[PDB]
Design a protein around this motif. Structure first.
Motif, PDB file in Angstrom:
ATOM      1  N   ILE A 104      65.912 138.612  55.556  1.00 50.83           N
ATOM      2  CA  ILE A 104      66.442 139.476  54.506  1.00 50.83           C
ATOM      3  C   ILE A 104      65.600 139.292  53.261  1.00 50.83           C
ATOM      4  O   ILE A 104      65.226 138.164  52.922  1.00 50.83           O
ATOM      5  CB  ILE A 104      67.917 139.141  54.231  1.00 50.83           C
ATOM      6  CG1 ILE A 104      68.754 139.449  55.485  1.00 50.83           C
ATOM      7  CG2 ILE A 104      68.426 139.890  53.014  1.00 50.83           C
ATOM      8  CD1 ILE A 104      70.103 138.740  55.479  1.00 50.83           C
ATOM      9  N   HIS A 108      68.447 140.759  45.061  1.00 51.17           N
ATOM     10  CA  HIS A 108      69.542 139.809  44.886  1.00 51.17           C
ATOM     11  C   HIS A 108      69.596 138.725  45.944  1.00 51.17           C
ATOM     12  O   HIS A 108      70.290 137.719  45.758  1.00 51.17           O
ATOM     13  CB  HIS A 108      70.880 140.557  44.753  1.00 51.17           C
ATOM     14  CG  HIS A 108      71.471 141.045  46.044  1.00 51.17           C
ATOM     15  ND1 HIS A 108      70.815 141.907  46.895  1.00 51.17           N
ATOM     16  CD2 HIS A 108      72.680 140.808  46.593  1.00 51.17           C
ATOM     17  CE1 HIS A 108      71.597 142.170  47.926  1.00 51.17           C
ATOM     18  NE2 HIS A 108      72.730 141.510  47.771  1.00 51.17           N
ATOM     19  N   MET A 109      68.897 138.907  47.056  1.00 52.32           N
ATOM     20  CA  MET A 109      68.806 137.913  48.129  1.00 52.32           C
ATOM     21  C   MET A 109      67.344 137.852  48.572  1.00 52.32           C
ATOM     22  O   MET A 109      66.970 138.338  49.654  1.00 52.32           O
ATOM     23  CB  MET A 109      69.742 138.264  49.280  1.00 52.32           C
ATOM     24  CG  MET A 109      69.702 137.248  50.399  1.00 52.32           C
ATOM     25  SD  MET A 109      71.148 137.324  51.479  1.00 52.32           S
ATOM     26  CE  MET A 109      72.385 136.568  50.434  1.00 52.32           C
ATOM     27  N   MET A 112      65.015 135.443  52.302  1.00 52.83           N
ATOM     28  CA  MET A 112      66.116 134.728  52.920  1.00 52.83           C
ATOM     29  C   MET A 112      65.971 134.771  54.437  1.00 52.83           C
ATOM     30  O   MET A 112      65.893 135.848  55.030  1.00 52.83           O
ATOM     31  CB  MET A 112      67.449 135.362  52.517  1.00 52.83           C
ATOM     32  CG  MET A 112      68.651 134.885  53.325  1.00 52.83           C
ATOM     33  SD  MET A 112      69.041 133.154  53.047  1.00 52.83           S
ATOM     34  CE  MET A 112      69.768 133.233  51.438  1.00 52.83           C
ATOM     35  N   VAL A 114      67.763 133.646  57.995  1.00 52.38           N
ATOM     36  CA  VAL A 114      69.074 133.334  58.537  1.00 52.38           C
ATOM     37  C   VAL A 114      68.932 133.115  60.039  1.00 52.38           C
ATOM     38  O   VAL A 114      68.639 134.046  60.784  1.00 52.38           O
ATOM     39  CB  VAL A 114      70.088 134.450  58.241  1.00 52.38           C
ATOM     40  CG1 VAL A 114      71.453 134.053  58.697  1.00 52.38           C
ATOM     41  CG2 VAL A 114      70.090 134.791  56.759  1.00 52.38           C
ATOM     42  N   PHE A 140      77.016 136.539  63.236  1.00 52.26           N
ATOM     43  CA  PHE A 140      76.645 136.768  61.834  1.00 52.26           C
ATOM     44  C   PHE A 140      77.921 136.974  61.028  1.00 52.26           C
ATOM     45  O   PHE A 140      78.276 138.109  60.692  1.00 52.26           O
ATOM     46  CB  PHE A 140      75.720 137.983  61.705  1.00 52.26           C
ATOM     47  CG  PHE A 140      75.013 138.100  60.376  1.00 52.26           C
ATOM     48  CD1 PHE A 140      74.489 136.980  59.734  1.00 52.26           C
ATOM     49  CD2 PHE A 140      74.857 139.322  59.748  1.00 52.26           C
ATOM     50  CE1 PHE A 140      73.844 137.091  58.514  1.00 52.26           C
ATOM     51  CE2 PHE A 140      74.185 139.439  58.536  1.00 52.26           C
ATOM     52  CZ  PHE A 140      73.686 138.331  57.919  1.00 52.26           C
ATOM     53  N   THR A 142      79.587 137.526  58.257  1.00 51.88           N
ATOM     54  CA  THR A 142      79.655 138.023  56.890  1.00 51.88           C
ATOM     55  C   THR A 142      80.196 139.437  56.901  1.00 51.88           C
ATOM     56  O   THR A 142      79.935 140.205  57.828  1.00 51.88           O
ATOM     57  CB  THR A 142      78.267 138.028  56.233  1.00 51.88           C
ATOM     58  OG1 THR A 142      78.380 138.516  54.886  1.00 51.88           O
ATOM     59  CG2 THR A 142      77.309 138.951  57.010  1.00 51.88           C
ATOM     60  N   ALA A 144      79.239 141.305  54.293  1.00 58.20           N
ATOM     61  CA  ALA A 144      78.331 141.922  53.331  1.00 58.20           C
ATOM     62  C   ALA A 144      76.926 142.119  53.866  1.00 58.20           C
ATOM     63  O   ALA A 144      75.976 142.229  53.074  1.00 58.20           O
ATOM     64  CB  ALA A 144      78.294 141.094  52.044  1.00 58.20           C
ATOM     65  N   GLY A 145      76.778 142.223  55.193  1.00 57.76           N
ATOM     66  CA  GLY A 145      75.461 142.413  55.803  1.00 57.76           C
ATOM     67  C   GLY A 145      74.976 143.851  55.822  1.00 57.76           C
ATOM     68  O   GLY A 145      74.658 144.401  56.894  1.00 57.76           O
ATOM     69  N   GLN A 146      74.889 144.460  54.650  1.00 53.88           N
ATOM     70  CA  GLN A 146      74.655 145.882  54.498  1.00 53.88           C
ATOM     71  C   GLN A 146      73.345 146.159  53.783  1.00 53.88           C
ATOM     72  O   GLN A 146      73.199 147.210  53.146  1.00 53.88           O
ATOM     73  CB  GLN A 146      75.816 146.546  53.766  1.00 53.88           C
ATOM     74  CG  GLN A 146      77.164 146.371  54.443  1.00 53.88           C
ATOM     75  CD  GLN A 146      77.188 146.929  55.830  1.00 53.88           C
ATOM     76  OE1 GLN A 146      76.726 148.048  56.072  1.00 53.88           O
ATOM     77  NE2 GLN A 146      77.721 146.155  56.765  1.00 53.88           N
ATOM     78  N   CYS A 147      72.368 145.245  53.921  1.00 56.46           N
ATOM     79  CA  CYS A 147      71.089 145.320  53.226  1.00 56.46           C
ATOM     80  C   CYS A 147      69.916 145.423  54.197  1.00 56.46           C
ATOM     81  O   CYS A 147      68.768 145.186  53.809  1.00 56.46           O
ATOM     82  CB  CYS A 147      70.873 144.088  52.333  1.00 56.46           C
ATOM     83  SG  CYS A 147      72.150 143.749  51.124  1.00 56.46           S
TER      84      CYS A 147
HETATM   85  C1  G7F Z   1      73.143 142.516  51.923  1.00 54.38           C
HETATM   86  C2  G7F Z   1      72.462 141.179  52.082  1.00 54.38           C
HETATM   87  C3  G7F Z   1      73.186 140.310  53.079  1.00 54.38           C
HETATM   88  O1  G7F Z   1      72.913 140.359  54.282  1.00 54.38           O
HETATM   89  N1  G7F Z   1      74.182 139.533  52.664  1.00 54.38           N
HETATM   90  C4  G7F Z   1      74.584 139.370  51.256  1.00 54.38           C
HETATM   91  C5  G7F Z   1      74.977 138.789  53.619  1.00 54.38           C
HETATM   92  C6  G7F Z   1      74.624 137.324  53.581  1.00 54.38           C
HETATM   93  N2  G7F Z   1      75.207 136.314  52.897  1.00 54.38           N
HETATM   94  C7  G7F Z   1      74.620 135.093  53.074  1.00 54.38           C
HETATM   95  C8  G7F Z   1      73.483 135.150  53.990  1.00 54.38           C
HETATM   96  S1  G7F Z   1      73.268 136.780  54.529  1.00 54.38           S
HETATM   97  C9  G7F Z   1      72.589 134.040  54.455  1.00 54.38           C
HETATM   98  C10 G7F Z   1      72.895 132.844  53.556  1.00 54.38           C
HETATM   99  C11 G7F Z   1      74.383 132.653  53.274  1.00 54.38           C
HETATM  100  C12 G7F Z   1      75.027 133.779  52.452  1.00 54.38           C
END
Ligand code: G7F
Length: 180
Positions: A104, A108-109, A112, A114, A140, A142, A144-147
């Motif tokens: 990712i 904002h991230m 990253m 994962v 996975f 979360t 918020a995996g919308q990126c």
């Molecule tokens: C939209 C970006 C995304 O995929 N998000 C914010 C979900 C994730 N949160 C975390 C991730 S991926 C890997 C590290 C822990 C928090």
């Protein structure tokens, strides 16, 4: 190790932070001025890439031979720079993997990585009300995996992350022919 070595080199040369009116997304540059994004990014006539305003020359939302959404949008960018050609790392057929890493890269991230583990065939999936094809599934947890995000294994680029159910995530599988 070797898996992360490949993922790191892909980030550096081919994975970019972008912003559309729909938010922040990970973009995979494939070759030349051709890139791919999750379809929900809905790129417009312009896009922000690494803080620069870039014109989008063409945007194609990919479907299968039945017209079923694949949740991938191919864009051609108005730029002189060229992505390193990574198509040889995209398999000819959609491929599963073990020990996969999701890359990712958004404002904002940033940068990253994962570990998602095993990526398994799933196929047809109703993604937020939209029937979608050619998906794969992994752990996975979360909401918020919308990126977006680039799913990789050792030397292979296998998917674009498209969403999830809060426990598993799903990717649109990548095939080399999409980028021919
Ligand atoms: C939209 C970006 C995304 O995929 N998000 C914010 C979900 C994730 N949160 C975390 C991730 S991926 C890997 C590290 C822990 C928090």
């Amino acid at each position: 190790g070797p898996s992360l070595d490949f993922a790191l080199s892909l980030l550096r040369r081919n994975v970019r932070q972008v912003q559309t009116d729909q938010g922040h997304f990970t973009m995979l540059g494939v070759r030349d001025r051709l890139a791919v994004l999750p379809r929900h990014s809905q790129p417009g006539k312009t896009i922000w890439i690494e803080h620069k305003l870039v014109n989008v020359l063409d945007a194609v939302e990919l479907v299968d031979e039945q017209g079923v959404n694949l949740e991938l949008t191919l864009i051609t960018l108005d730029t002189n720079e060229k992505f390193r050609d990574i198509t040889k790392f995209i398999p000819e057929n959609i491929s599963t993997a073990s020990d996969a890493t999701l890359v990712i890269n958004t404002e904002h991230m940033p940068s990253m990585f994962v570990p998602v583990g095993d990526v398994v065939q799933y196929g047809f999936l109703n993604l937020s009300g939209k029937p979608t094809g050619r998906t794969m599934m992994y752990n996975f947890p979360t909401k918020a995996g919308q990126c977006g995000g680039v799913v990789t294994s050792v030397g292979k680029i296998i998917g674009i992350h498209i969403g999830g159910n809060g426990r598993q995530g799903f990717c649109a599988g990548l095939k080399r022919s999409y980028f021919a």
